[PDB]
Design a protein around this ligand. Structure first.
Ligand SMILES: *[C@@H](C)C1=C(C)[C@H](CC2=N/C(=C\c3[nH]c(C[C@@H]4NC(=O)C(C)=C4[C@@H](*)C)c(C)c3CCC(=O)O)C(CCC(=O)O)=C2C)NC1=O
Ligand SMILES: *[C@@H](C)[C@H]1/C(=C/c2[nH]c(/C=C3N=C(/C=C4\NC(=O)C(CC)=C4C)C(C)=C\3CCC(=O)O)c(CCC(=O)O)c2C)NC(=O)[C@@H]1C
Ligand SMILES: *[C@@H](C)[C@H]1/C(=C/c2[nH]c(/C=C3N=C(/C=C4\NC(=O)C(CC)=C4C)C(C)=C\3CCC(=O)O)c(CCC(=O)O)c2C)NC(=O)[C@@H]1C
Ligand SMILES: *[C@@H](C)[C@H]1/C(=C/c2[nH]c(/C=C3N=C(/C=C4\NC(=O)C(CC)=C4C)C(C)=C\3CCC(=O)O)c(CCC(=O)O)c2C)NC(=O)[C@@H]1C
Ligand SMILES: *[C@@H](C)[C@H]1/C(=C/c2[nH]c(/C=C3N=C(/C=C4\NC(=O)C(CC)=C4C)C(C)=C\3CCC(=O)O)c(CCC(=O)O)c2C)NC(=O)[C@@H]1C
Lengths: 164, 177
């Protein structure tokens, strides 16, 4: 899983090297940023159902057609599965934040998303709708601090560039 | 390859759980003890050819039959393949302590080690006393308790960090025994 500490060890390992100063200077950066990403993580972990709901609703307020027969929110089992994907993705954004590396979002949510949504006829636009709304809801003393908001906001931009 | 933090999200995923306040509190202590962990890795790495020449020479003065014909550290190719192997174990020990997690060692070093060792004929009973001396050396370098070499750190407690290095060395023994 890509993180700061995984990316220096694999590289040192590739070179058959013991860890050196650049590897110890790198891990210290992880520790300087830990406070601000664990803060965001805590806040989404605490009130996540509230933001996933919001977020789900937003795709359907933008793309009402999904409710039509033959489409991906034609019935409630399906609509329920859409909100469950926004929770799956937000649990992966909480995971990315604790790890301080996109490896969790990369392995479990991004890899193969493109093949699964094409075969099952799920529009990437509709997932982008959700994440833009979730991203832009953030009020950066209200909901969390400024630098934890940097962590939240662009942990979500990483997902949006992945689908687009 | 996983670290301390991805260990907690691997564990949270399985239960379909976001990372919880308590898990989140285990991680804060590792943030708190972050400067000491770098010092602990620094002392091993800076005395790294020492830990290994003494590990391998210890094994030898304890079993001279190793440098006898048919003993596996007999010929120079062989003496060298074993210092090389001890050099590999310590480096994955150093990696694991940097990560706060054993998986790089498990995957990238210890997977296949007893097996390969059976085939080459190298004596796993003498391998274990090289690793035990290494442990005894590493534990006391991060504790600044080395006989010949003392360093100047700001004082505090590092026994927790000593316990996991011992534990990474113990893993290695367990896997070839
Ligand atoms: C027979 C010829 C013997 C050898 C060789 C041998 C080796 C043992 N080393 C043990 C522990 C240990 N290694 C060192 C290395 C060391 N000390 C320094 O200060 C510096 C510098 C070096 C590297 C060169 C350390 C740090 C220790 C800890 C002991 C100490 O007071 O420093 C050891 C004991 C194993 C155990 O506790 O089970 C050996 C065996 N001894 C021979 O008989
Ligand atoms: C609103 C966003 C969209 C919606 C979604 C929808 N999801 C599926 C099916 C799947 N979606 C997932 C996604 C994940 N599962 C995971 O394990 C993870 C990673 C940890 C995620 C984020 C997968 C893999 C599937 C396939 C399996 C399944 O049936 O759940 C469906 C069902 C598809 C169908 O038509 O039967 C739906 C409804 N629907 C919408 O309205 C959106 C466009
Ligand atoms: C500044 C962006 C704008 C602002 C915001 C505003 N937010 C709410 C209420 C909610 N928005 C959130 C967002 C989150 N809650 C969290 O804990 C997290 C962390 C992952 C986020 C980013 C949620 C879920 C709500 C609902 C819960 C609640 O009432 O607290 C409001 C309330 C009114 C409303 O829903 O519109 C406001 C005032 N105010 C502005 O207009 C700003 C430009
Ligand atoms: C003292 C430590 C012991 C000893 C060791 C010994 N090792 C070999 C040969 C090999 N051991 C390895 C193992 C690894 N090399 C790696 O790339 C890694 C990472 C996964 C490890 C830890 C391998 C693959 C070999 C085979 C090829 C090679 O020799 O490098 C030997 C040589 C045996 C021979 O005669 O060909 C020896 C001597 N010998 C002892 O007496 C010890 C107790
Ligand atoms: C057990 C290991 C020994 C021990 C360690 C000890 N270290 C500190 C304080 C600091 N550690 C460092 C050193 C490094 N961190 C880095 O940034 C790097 C990377 C290139 C290194 C090598 C630093 C910078 C400090 C002090 C300054 C600061 O505020 O960051 C302590 C004090 C408590 C603490 O963890 O801050 C201790 C306990 N002390 C022993 O007694 C050991 C045997």
């Amino acid at each position: 899983m890509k993180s700061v500490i995984t990316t220096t060890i694999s590289a040192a390992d590739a070179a058959g090297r013991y860890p050196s100063t650049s590897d110890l200077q790198s891990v210290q950066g992880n520790i300087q940023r830990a406070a601000a990403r664990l803060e965001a993580a805590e806040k989404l972990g605490s009130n996540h159902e509230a933001v996933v709901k919001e977020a789900g609703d937003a795709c359907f307020s933008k793309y009402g057609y999904n409710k039509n027969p033959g489409e991906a929110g034609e019935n409630q089992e399906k609509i329920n599965k859409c909100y469950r994907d926004i929770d799956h993705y937000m649990r992966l954004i909480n995971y990315t934040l604790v790890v301080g590396g996109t490896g969790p979002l990369d392995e479990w949510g991004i890899a193969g998303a493109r093949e699964v949504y094409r075969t099952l006829n799920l529009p990437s636009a509709a997932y982008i709708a959700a994440f833009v709304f979730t991203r832009d809801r953030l009020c950066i003393p209200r909901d969390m601090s400024a630098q934890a908001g940097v962590e939240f906001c662009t942990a979500l931009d990483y997902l949006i560039n992945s689908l687009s | 390859m996983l670290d301390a933090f991805s260990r907690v999200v691997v564990n949270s995923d399985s239960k379909a759980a976001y990372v919880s306040g308590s898990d989140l509190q285990a991680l804060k202590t590792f943030i708190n003890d972050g400067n000491k962990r770098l010092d602990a890795v620094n002392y091993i790495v800076s005395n790294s050819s020492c830990i290994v020449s003494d590990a391998i020479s210890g094994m030898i003065c304890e079993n001279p039959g190793l440098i006898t014909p048919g003993g596996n550290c007999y010929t120079n190719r062989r003496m060298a393949a074993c210092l090389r192997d001890g050099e590999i174990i310590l480096r994955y020990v150093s990696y694991a302590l940097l990560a706060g997690d054993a998986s790089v060692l498990e995957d990238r070093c210890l997977n296949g080690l007893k097996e390969t060792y059976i085939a080459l004929g190298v004596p796993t009973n003498s391998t274990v006393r090289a690793v035990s001396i290494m442990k005894a050396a590493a534990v006391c370098f991060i504790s600044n308790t080395a006989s010949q070499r003392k360093v100047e750190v700001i004082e505090g407690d590092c026994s927790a960090l000593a316990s996991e290095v011992a534990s990474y060395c113990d893993r290695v023994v367990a896997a070839v025994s």
